[PDB]
Amino acid sequence: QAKILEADAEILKAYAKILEAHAEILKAQ
Amino acid sequence: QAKILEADAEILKAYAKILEAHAEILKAQ
Amino acid sequence: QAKILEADAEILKAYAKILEAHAEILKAQ
Amino acid sequence: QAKILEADAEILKAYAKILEAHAEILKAQ
Amino acid sequence: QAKILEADAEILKAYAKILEAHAEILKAQ
Amino acid sequence: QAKILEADAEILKAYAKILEAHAEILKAQ
Amino acid sequence: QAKILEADAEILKAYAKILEAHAEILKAQ
Amino acid sequence: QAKILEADAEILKAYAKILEAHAEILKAQ
Amino acid sequence: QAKILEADAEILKAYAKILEAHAEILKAQ
Amino acid sequence: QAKILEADAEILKAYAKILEAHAEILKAQ
Amino acid sequence: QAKILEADAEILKAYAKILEAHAEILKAQ
Amino acid sequence: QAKILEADAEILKAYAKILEAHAEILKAQ
Amino acid sequence: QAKILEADAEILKAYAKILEAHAEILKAQ
Amino acid sequence: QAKILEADAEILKAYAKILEAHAEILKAQ
Amino acid sequence: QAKILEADAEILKAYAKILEAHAEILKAQ
Amino acid sequence: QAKILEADAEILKAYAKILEAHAEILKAQ
Amino acid sequence: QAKILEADAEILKAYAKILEAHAEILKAQ
Amino acid sequence: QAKILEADAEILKAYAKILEAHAEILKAQ
Amino acid sequence: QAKILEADAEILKAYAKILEAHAEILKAQ
Amino acid sequence: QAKILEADAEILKAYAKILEAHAEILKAQ
Amino acid sequence: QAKILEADAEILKAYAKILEAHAEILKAQ
Amino acid sequence: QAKILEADAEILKAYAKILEAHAEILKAQ
Amino acid sequence: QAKILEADAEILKAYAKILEAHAEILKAQ
Amino acid sequence: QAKILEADAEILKAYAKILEAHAEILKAQ
Amino acid sequence: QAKILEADAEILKAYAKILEAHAEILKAQ
Amino acid sequence: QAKILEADAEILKAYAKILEAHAEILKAQ
Amino acid sequence: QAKILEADAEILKAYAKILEAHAEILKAQ
Amino acid sequence: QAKILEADAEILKAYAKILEAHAEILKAQ
Amino acid sequence: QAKILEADAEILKAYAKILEAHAEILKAQ
Amino acid sequence: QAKILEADAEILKAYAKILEAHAEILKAQ
Amino acid sequence: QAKILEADAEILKAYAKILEAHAEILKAQ
Amino acid sequence: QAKILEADAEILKAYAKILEAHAEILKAQ
Amino acid sequence: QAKILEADAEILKAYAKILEAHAEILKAQ
Amino acid sequence: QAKILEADAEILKAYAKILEAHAEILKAQ
Amino acid sequence: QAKILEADAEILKAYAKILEAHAEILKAQ
Amino acid sequence: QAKILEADAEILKAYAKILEAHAEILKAQ
Amino acid sequence: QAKILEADAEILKAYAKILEAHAEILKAQ
Amino acid sequence: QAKILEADAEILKAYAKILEAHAEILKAQ
Amino acid sequence: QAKILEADAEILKAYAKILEAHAEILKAQ
Amino acid sequence: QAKILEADAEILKAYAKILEAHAEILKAQ
Amino acid sequence: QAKILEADAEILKAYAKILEAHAEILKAQ
Amino acid sequence: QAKILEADAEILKAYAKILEAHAEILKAQ
Amino acid sequence: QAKILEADAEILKAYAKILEAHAEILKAQ
Amino acid sequence: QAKILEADAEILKAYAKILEAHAEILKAQ
Amino acid sequence: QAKILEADAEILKAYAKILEAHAEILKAQ
Amino acid sequence: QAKILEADAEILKAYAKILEAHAEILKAQ
Amino acid sequence: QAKILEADAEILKAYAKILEAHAEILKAQ
Amino acid sequence: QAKILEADAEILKAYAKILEAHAEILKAQ
Amino acid sequence: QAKILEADAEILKAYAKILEAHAEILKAQ
Amino acid sequence: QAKILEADAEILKAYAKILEAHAEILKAQ
Amino acid sequence: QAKILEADAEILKAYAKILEAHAEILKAQ
Amino acid sequence: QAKILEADAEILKAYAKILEAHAEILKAQ
Amino acid sequence: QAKILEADAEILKAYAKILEAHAEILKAQ
Amino acid sequence: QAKILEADAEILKAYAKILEAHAEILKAQ
Amino acid sequence: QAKILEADAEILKAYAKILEAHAEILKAQ
């Protein structure tokens, strides 16, 4: 079951990388 | 069982990285 | 089922790389 | 049993990182 | 079914590489 | 047995970091 | 079915290599 | 046996950090 | 049908190798 | 034997830090 | 029909190898 | 043997720091 | 032997700091 | 342990509600 | 654990709504 | 140790209630 | 899990709308 | 040692009660 | 999952429109 | 040495009682 | 999937138009 | 040296009694 | 798929035009 | 696919023209 | 409690500084 | 609570500095 | 709340520094 | 909210620095 | 929004540095 | 938006450094 | 657009370094 | 276009390094 | 085009290193 | 063309290394 | 032609290595 | 011709290695 | 002819290895 | 005979690793 | 004979590691 | 012969490490 | 011959380290 | 010849370290 | 020749360190 | 030539350090 | 808080009017 | 906050007018 | 914000006019 | 933003005129 | 932007004229 | 940009004239 | 670009003349 | 380009002359 | 290029003469 | 060298005697 | 050199005697 929660954390970490990239866009403007 | 709790900690750390990314957006604005 | 969620994370990570590339475009201008 | 208590400490440290990120949100505003 | 979503991730990663290449052109000019 | 008491100290240090984060929020308000 | 999408990804990766080569020409000048 | 007493000192130091954090709250209010 | 699109990717990769060869000429001059 | 007495000194020093933290609480009020 | 497009790709790859040999001749001068 | 007497001095200095902390409370009241 | 007498002086200086701490208590009252 | 995951679901639903309120208030702008 | 995935769906739908409102406000510009 | 995890569930539920009240007060604004 | 994939579809459709608005606004320039 | 963990549970439950009262008083605001 | 590939087609059509507008502006130059 | 740990348990229980009284008096406000 | 290949055709046609405009502007030089 | 540790236990028990009486007085307020 | 091959023909014709203009401008040199 | 072969003929004719101009400028040297 | 009365004295001293500044205005005319 | 009265005294001291500055204006003429 | 009143004092102190600057101008003339 | 008022104080402090610079000009003349 | 007002303060501080530089010119003459 | 105003402040700070450098020439003469 | 203004600031900072170097010559004479 | 202005800044920075080197010569004489 | 100006900067930086080397000779004499 | 100017910079950098070597000779003497 | 100038730079770099070696002799004596 | 000059550089680099070896002898003495 | 000069360089490099071996003897003694 | 003495050194080094492991045990307790 | 003396040094260094391990034993207690 | 004296130095250095380890034991007591 | 004297210096430096170790013993007692 | 005198200086520096160690012995007694 | 006189200075500096060490003995006695 | 005179100054400075060390002896007696 | 920023705008507009009057009166001189 | 930026524009325009008056009055000199 | 950049252009043009008048008056000298 | 770059051109042209007048006045000397 | 590079050409020509005047005035010496 | 390269040629010719005059004046010595 | 290489030849000829003057002046010594 | 190689020949001949004069002055020694 | 090889021959002959003079001066010793 | 190994045997025998005394004194405890 | 190794044997025998006397004293305790 541990890999399921690990994949959940990977999903949310990917979401965090999305928001960091969007931040880097908005900083670059 | 310790890997399950470690995965819980990774979930909440991912949530913290989400909130830090959102703060990075709002700081950049 | 964990590989399905891993593939979801790969999709969103690819999306993050898209926005990072768009950031690098707009920063290079 | 030490790894169980270490995982508990990791959980609460992640919670502290959540609250610090919320502080970053509120300070950035 | 995971190979289908993996192929989707490969498609979007290829599109990200397209945008990085276009960034390489625009940076090189 | 010393690692158990070390883990106890890590638990209480994590709790102290929670209260410091809460203080950082309340100072930032 | 997934091999078709893999071939699509190969097409777009080839396009990315085209644009990288064109960038290499333009950088070399 | 010295590591046991050292861990005891770490426990009480953690409690002192808790009380300093609570003081930091009550000063911040 | 996948071999057709694979051959298309081979065509465009050959064109990319042409452009890299032209780059190697222009760099060597 | 010296490390045992050093750990005793660390215990009482931690107790002193506890009382200084309590002093910080009572002073900040 | 895949062998026809494969032969086209081989023609263009041969042209690229011609161009790379011309590059090596020009570089060695 | 000098480290033993040094640790004795550390013990009594720790007791003095306890007593100064209690002094700091009683002054702060 | 000089470090032994130095440690003796450290012992008596620690006792003097105890007496100064008790003095600071009685002054603060 | 299921209460932890249910609380994680409540946290993420609250984050979704905050993002929806942010969405409608940027829609109003 | 399906509540976690449904909350992820709500989060991603909220991000889609934010991006749609951003699309409308860039259409207005 | 289950009391610790249940208290963690109570803590995260309280944080969810705080975030829900924050969502309502941003809905009112 | 189809809600997640439909949310991905909404995300990419919103990105397509943003790219179309960027396309027409570079057409206007 | 189990008394220490039970005291940790009591501490975290009290922190949860404080956070619940803070949630209620922010609900009243 | 056909919505995902349809959104990919919309993305690629948008990239085609951007490249066509870039072609028109380089025609004007 | 178990008396030290039992005294630590009594200290932490007293801190829990103080926190519970603080929770009650913030509930009364 | 015919929309994907049609968008690929549009992309390569746009690249052909860009290369034709580049050929014309090198003819002008 | 066990007298020293027993005296430490008596000290910490006295501090626990002081904190308990402080808890009762704050309960009375 | 014939649109893809026609676009390949357009790309190769554009490359031929670039090479012809390069041949003319080296004829002028 | 006759357009592809005709474009290959145009490419090779352009390479022949480039080699002819290079041979003429080597005759001039 | 002494810090409270000290703060009261600081308030009244600030008030005395206000009246001294008012005397400075009335003298300076 | 003492920091609140300290801040009140800081407000009044700032007001006294305003009146001293206005006095120094009026004296400076 | 103490930081709010501290910031108020900083506002009025900044106004006092403005007034002293105007004083120094008028004295300099 | 405190950072907003702090930024107001920074604005007016910058204004005071402007007037002191004008004073330094007028004194230097 | 605090970073916006901070940037305003940075603008006016840069203006003050311009005026101090002009002062240093006129003093140096 | 804050990066734009920060860049404006960098422009004016660069102007101030130009002016101080010109002052350095004029002082050195 | 921020990188363009940053590059402008870099241009004027380079000009400032030019005048500082010229001042360093004239001071060195 | 940002890299063009960046290269302009590098040109003028190189010129400043020339002048600093000439200063170092004239200082060393 | 940016690499051309970068090469110009490299030329002038090489000239600066020439003059710094001549400074090293003339200082060493 | 850029590699030619890069080679020019390499020539002058080698010349600077010659003069630095001559400086190292004359300094070592 | 670039490799010829690169070889010239290699010749002069070799001469610089000769002079550095001769310097290292004269330093070693 | 470039390989001839490269061989010349190899000759002079061999001479430099000779003098470095001679220096290593003279340093070793 | 380049291999002749390369063999000359190999001769002198072998001579350099002779002198380095002689250095190894003279250092080893 | 050197390998015999080397083996003696390996024997005593193994004994040292035994005692280090025993210290690692006793430290870990 | 050098390897014999080196082996003697290895023996005594192993003895030093024995005494350092015994120091680790005695320090750990 | 230099390796013999070097081995002698290694012997005496090993003896010094023995005495340093013995000092480390005697300090640790 | 310099390596012989260097080895002599290594011998005497090892002797100095012996005396420093014996000093560390005598200081540690 | 310089390395011989450098080795002489190393010999006498080693002798100075011997005398400093002897001094540290006689001071530590 | 400068390294010879530098080594002479190092010899006499080592002699000065000898005399300072002997002074440190005689001061320590 | 400057390094020769610098080495002369280093010789005489070393002589001055000799005389100051002899002063340390003669003062310490 | 918008009244504060509006009053800041009025202040800065008044400073602009004062600077315009100063510009006019220096135009009259 | 746009009034603040417009007031900054008025301020900088007034500074430009002052600099133009300084320019024409140095033109008159 | 275009008024800010336009005022920057006016400031830089005024500085250019000042430098032109300085160039004229140094031409007259 | 072309006004900014045009003002930069005017600034650098004015610096060129100043350097030309300096060149003329050093030609006259 | 060609005015910028033309001004760079004027700057470098002015530096060449200054260097030519320095050359002829060292020729006159 | 040919003016830049011609100015570089003028710079290097001026440096050549400076070095020739330096060669003549070292011929005179 | 041939002017650059010709100026390089002039520079290297000047360095040859400097080395020849150094050669004859060491011949005269 | 042959002027560069001829200048290299002049440089190497000058180095040969310097080495020959060094050989003569070592023959005289 | 034969001048380069002849200069290499002169360099190697000069090294032979230096080694012969070294052989004679070691024959004299 | 047999004296050295016999001294090693005496050293290890003394260590065995010390360990036997430690063994019997832990037997008595 | 046998005197050196014999002195090493005497040193190690003395260390063995010191360890034996230490063993006899630890036996007496």
Numbering used by the authors:
A (entry chain U), B (entry chain O), C (entry chain a), D (entry chain I), E (entry chain g), F (entry chain C), ...: 1 to 29
N (entry chain FA), O (entry chain LA), P (entry chain 9), Q (entry chain RA), R (entry chain 3), S (entry chain XA), ...: 101 to 129
Sentences from the paper on this structure:
Here we report seven high-resolution cryo-EM structures of filamentous peptide nanotubes based on a cross-α supramolecular architecture that provide insight into the designability of helical peptide filaments. A structural interaction is identified based on an appropriately placed pair of arginine residues (RxxxR) within the corresponding peptide sequences. In contrast to most structurally characterized filaments based on synthetic α-helical coiled-coils, the chain axes of the helical protomers are oriented in a plane nearly perpendicular to the long axis of the assembly.
In order to better compare the two models, cryo-EM data were collected on a fresh preparation of Form II filaments. A structural comparison of the two assemblies indicated that helical protomers were arranged in four (Form I) or three (Form II) cross-helical stacks (i.e., protofilaments) that self-associated laterally to form single-walled and double-walled nanotubes, respectively. The main distinguishing feature between the Form I and Form II assemblies was the mode of lateral association between the respective cross α-helical stacks. Each nanotube was derived from coalesence of three protofilaments derived from the dimeric protomer. However, these were arranged in different symmetries; C3 for 29-20-2 and C1 for Form II. The main difference between the structures was manifested in terms of the lateral interactions between the termini of the protofilaments. These interactions occurred along the direction of the left-handed 12-start and 11-start helices for 29-20-2 and Form II, respectively, as illustrated in the the helical net diagrams of the corresponding assemblies. Among all three structures, the helices within the dimeric asymmetric unit could be superimposed with only minimal differences. Structural overlays of laterally interacting protofilaments indicated a conservation of the interfaces between the three filament structures.
